[PDB]
């Protein structure tokens, strides 16, 4: 089960893993599946290929991933991002995140403002931040 999926994909991608920058390696694999979703369009059908993608990417760049096994050291980090990572908003990430999972139900409404869950995440995040500093 786990070995058949690993050894099969490892032997094919090993040549382009050690040489290619893991930042470009992910970006290509991501833009491709994004266009595989626009050709096919089932959402549970689409969770199946992505979830089998998540497991292999973990085998590859996760702890002890074939990458960390090939190269020692390596703090992690597949890309350093300037300005854009500092300028990306959580509220915008949530709305896009909700666009894929909400689907039907409460409409997006105006920018800012949250559903019940968004507020629970935002406050739990804001609460755990001010208490840990104590």
């Amino acid at each position: 089960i786990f070995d058949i999926y690993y050894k099969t994909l490892d032997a094919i991608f090993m040549p382009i893993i050690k040489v290619l920058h893991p930042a470009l390696a992910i970006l290509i694999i991501a833009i491709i599946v994004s266009l595989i979703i626009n050709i096919a369009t089932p959402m549970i059908y689409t969770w199946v290929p992505i979830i089998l993608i998540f497991i292999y990417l973990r085998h590859v760049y996760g702890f002890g991933g074939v990458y960390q096994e090939l190269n020692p050291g390596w703090n992690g980090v597949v890309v350093y991002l300037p300005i854009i990572l500092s300028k990306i908003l959580f509220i915008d990430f949530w709305h896009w995140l909700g666009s894929i999972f909400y689907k039907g139900g409460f409409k997006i409404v105006s920018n800012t403002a949250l559903g019940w869950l968004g507020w629970y995440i935002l406050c739990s995040f804001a609460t755990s931040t001010v208490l840990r500093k104590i």
Partner: antibody
Amino acid sequence: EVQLVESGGGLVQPGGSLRLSCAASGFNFSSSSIHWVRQAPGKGLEWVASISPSYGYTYYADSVKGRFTISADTSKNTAYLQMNSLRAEDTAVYYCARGIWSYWYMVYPHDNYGMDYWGQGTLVTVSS
Amino acid sequence: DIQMTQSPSSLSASVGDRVTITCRASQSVSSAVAWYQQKPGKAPKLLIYSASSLYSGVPSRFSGSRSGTDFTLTISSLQPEDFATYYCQQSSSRPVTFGQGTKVEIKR
């Protein structure tokens, strides 16, 4: 307005240990790779170890492998070279060198292409 | 392991002459090779990288070339400040390896 300052050289008994530091200034330490290259007295250049801060890759030579540990502190803007089980043949001047970087790095990491800037090095003598 | 055999070991030229140094790789390597100039008691400096790319500040009097596995450094018109030992490095594979060195001297 760039430079690298090695330090920590001196006489050491065989089987001891010494620790060299490379203080860099004038360029981006987080990006450019750092390299250690030693030159035995009267001989040519020899490659000891290379490291890439940020990504944290470590590259050692079969000569110093196991006795030498290279590291870099991004917050201090310095690259350290730890030397254990020093032997008589390791005596030489130790140059700290910055790798030279081309945009092809972005597509491919791990490519040296050369050394751009070399510190004047620090002398290390191992003898009783 | 890769070895780089550089020749000749030493040579005596004169001002205005044309010097040629050859660095032969042991096996197939990329076009990424560097040529270094080292004055006596000084740190090595970079002249040519990628075999053919001239490094900034280095006068056009210097130049590299790639013939198969034989990389070559060429000083068109030798100058008084160009006298020193020259090394050739292959950075296309690990471990990195340098050349034995070429010692250039004036003739009088």
